[PDB]
Design a protein around this nucleic acid. Structure first.
Lengths: 103, 93, 84, 98, 93, 107, 98, 84
DNA sequence: ATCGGATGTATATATCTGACACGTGCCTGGAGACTAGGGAGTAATCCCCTTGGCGGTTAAAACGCGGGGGAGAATCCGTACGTGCGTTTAAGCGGTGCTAGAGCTGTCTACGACCAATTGAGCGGCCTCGGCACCGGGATTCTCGA
DNA sequence: CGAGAATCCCGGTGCCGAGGCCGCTCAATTGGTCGTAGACAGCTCTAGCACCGCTTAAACGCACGTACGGATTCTCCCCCGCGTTTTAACCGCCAAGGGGATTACTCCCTAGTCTCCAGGCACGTGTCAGATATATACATCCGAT
């Protein structure tokens, strides 16, 4: 018995996502096996993309663990991720910026 | 009562991409919510697009078109490359 | 078992509004800004609480929940992360 | 004479402090009382979860901060440094709210 | 080659409200699109509401909660009044 | 063989709406019979609400038929309908309005 | 001297005319050529439907009219009567586009 | 069979932009407004046309359709009535 | 330009704790093995409509010029808001008590889906004449300068 | 503070699109059966609500001063209005062929049902990452020269 998540060389579950996908179709939907694997790789790439940026900011602050403050810095620091993610992070604060006229 | 979460997979990815840094509980919850949101968007777009062409099957083409429609630019390009590599790795096994 | 509240919008004091404005990044504030901000906040809270109360009414419950608040905020297109 | 700062520097110092900080700014008990009074109109004898109240507080604070940023942008555009109710109204009108 | 539309129903409602008024083809198409839009919004809200409470069916309670969530104020109260009167008439019939 | 849409005293279809709803639910999803009847009542009321205002606007122009321009005038003129319908009407034009300061000669 | 109008009254007359009228404003053939020029980048050798082109023109004009109205609001707020690129940029920034 | 187009953005002429502004309800126009408007229109058309091309490419077709254009506009939250 | 006290702010020092991180034990859900059938791919064909081109016409665009009104820059007044101090208020934290109400498990009971006729409702095609578009001629109302 | 110009009504002519009629066909109705979704009833026990007292951080009111918002002139140059000259959009007509829309055939991919056992979830415990003070070191701020 070889797990489907290991045949494709991924970390995210494939069978669990296949179950979730089949429960969100329209009253008769058939879900292909290949569809779940394609969607699993998308989630893994995006998760690995954010944690790369957040981890970089944590090292710059000479700290080890990642807090919600670091997640806000990475997302707002990125231009694409900022466009993709418009939700509000709890406890994330704001990016420091002062306009030229006020000084 | 058992509750399902993505914490184990998120921690696996974090350990792969940064072998020393850790995570906090609030950050893990935020990542869980973000993953749920993305998955919901992808599923909704794929189902709508499949209904749009008088079809009843969700294969890889609808998901590829959905991620192309949603993700912008080089994010979409890299995601498509990763997805097709994973699909070829699955089929060639 | 129950109680009544008569005027509670004055609990949002002037220093609190000043601190919110400082975090937003303003340097000098006028006088009517406090009243205008109180009105705007009241309107926003009324909308969100109405949606949350509808959600908790539909489920035949008696206590409002953070999950209902999150659903209401998502419905208004103001998605919030970090609460489920 | 006692040392006195010029009008404005303390405002900038407070801006830096509250921009680098990451905690809440409004008093939790008055916010709770206001939320309960507002919610009492739609239904009588409700109960609340502390997580729900906190989530409402965070959402309200984020909305207010964004609105104040837009208002400051409008005030700067109008060649001023002080924000005004007309700036607030213009920002809310352009955003399409009322 | 059969298409479906709401043209006859829109015409019946129009003849009910204004007995001696016409309609143009473009206006009829716009009305069809508007009706489809509302129907789709209502169906999506009802399905999401049913999924929230771990249910598996759509009922008048789901529809009423959805229309209360969508329609504002006077429209919402009048619409739920017509809905409940129609439902009790159908049930008594 | 009485109609199901006639038992509820409506004009919009009920069997057709029931079929449309059943092809929109999630997997293994059921649809109640009264759900279709409730949903058809809302659709008819909203259609009747819009059409009444459109006919009133048309009648002030001494015309007999309704054009897309009349739909824009009725929808944008009303308050609650405007907040509900945000789409673009093809050929509907706009509502005439000139700002106070723009009107020259200071009069 | 020949009859000459003052600056502004003819502009107001055009405002009234184009606000009560309801037809298209841009030339159909140049719009079609621009649409084809833009579309040839994504995929080569495409064909179009006249209804699709008309829908694109409709949406473009509606968006432009809305943006111009917001720009006029900004210009009125800044105590001026002429719209400016900075007004356009402020409106687009507040609306959250770029 | 095919051809090429070198610069077609100049087809949106100054009288056309002025008429759009008049319908929008402005009284006096500056000089750089035309160039700024051309840039904005180009960006908006690029986004909408890219979405429509993706939609028509998914269906293995070769002709773009008004249904695809309407679908792209709805996906962008700019719903249009009067075309199906 | 100094220059020089005053005072917020950043650093490198113990210290103490509670919060991540890992080890364990289940157990519910993911992974093979057949089987059936229904949806989708593929090939063939019809014909709609999209592209390309030609010619006349006229409305619209481009160009140029005169000038008047609006954008922007200086200069002053005064008043409203920021900065400090001394009081007064209630938020906050630490306990204790208690019951209203959120979850969790079982039981029928009443719902809704499937299936086989079957027939009327609604879609497609065809007319037709009247609502509406267009054209021409007065009547009226602004508007600019004597 | 009148005459020229733009607009508004008013009447006549024609024309093609909305409304009604007819044929037809396919999906809405009606019985009858059957499976399971959930509507209640009962029970547990979690936590939301309500007091009580001490600390002290933070609103609050008052004084004073200064700097920023309007108000007022003043200059110049930039966009508006109008007349001429190009130009290419528009309409009508024709022509050909690509590609969209159906139809029939076949095949293969996925859902369903058993078995089976091993990744994840709950729970418990430890130790060290990070709050917290804090005593300097210093980087600006503003009055004085």
């Amino acid at each position: 018995a070889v797990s489907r998540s290991q045949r494709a060389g991924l970390q995210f579950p494939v069978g669990r996502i296949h179950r979730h996908l089949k429960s969100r179709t329209t009253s008769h939907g058939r879900v292909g096996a290949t569809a779940a694997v394609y969607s699993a790789a998308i989630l893994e790439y995006l998760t690995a993309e954010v944690l790369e940026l957040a981890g970089n900011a944590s090292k710059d602050l000479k700290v080890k663990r990642i807090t919600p403050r670091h997640l806000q810095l990475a997302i707002r620091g990125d231009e694409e991720l900022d466009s993709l993610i418009k939700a509000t992070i709890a406890g994330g604060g704001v990016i420091p910026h002062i306009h030229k006229s006020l000084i | 009562t058992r509750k399902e979460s993505y914490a184990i997979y998120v921690y696996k990815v974090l350990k792969q991409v940064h072998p020393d840094t850790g995570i906090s509980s609030k950050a893990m919850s935020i990542m869980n919510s973000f993953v749920n949101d993305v998955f919901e968007r992808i599923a909704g777009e794929a189902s709508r697009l499949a209904h749009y062409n008088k079809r009843s099957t969700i294969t890889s083409r609808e998901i590829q078109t959905a991620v192309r429609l949603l993700l912008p630019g080089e994010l979409a390009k890299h995601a498509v490359s990763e997805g097709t590599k994973a699909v070829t790795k699955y089929t060639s096994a | 078992h129950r109680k009544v509240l008569r005027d509670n919008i004055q609990g949002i004091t002037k220093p609190a509004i000043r601190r919110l404005a400082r975090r937003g990044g303003v340097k000098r504030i006028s006088g009517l800004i406090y009243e205008e901000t109180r009105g705007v906040l009241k309107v926003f809270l009324e909308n969100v609480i109405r949606d949350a109360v509808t959600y908790t009414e539909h489920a035949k419950r008696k206590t409002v929940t953070a999950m209902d608040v999150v659903y209401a905020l998502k419905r208004q297109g103001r998605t919030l992360y970090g609460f489920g | 004479k006692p040392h006195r700062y010029r009008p404005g520097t303390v405002a900038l110092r407070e801006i830096r402090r509250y921009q680098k900080s990451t905690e809440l700014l409004i008093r939790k008990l008055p916010f709770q009382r206001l939320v309960r009074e507002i919610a009492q109109d739609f239904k009588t004898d409700l109960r609340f979860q502390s997580s729900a109240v906190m989530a409402l507080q965070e959402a309200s604070e984020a909305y207010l901060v964004a609105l104040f940023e837009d208002t400051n942008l409008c005030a700067i555009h109008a060649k001023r440094v002080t924000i005004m109710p007309k700036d607030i109204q213009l920002a809310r009108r352009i955003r399409g709210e009322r």
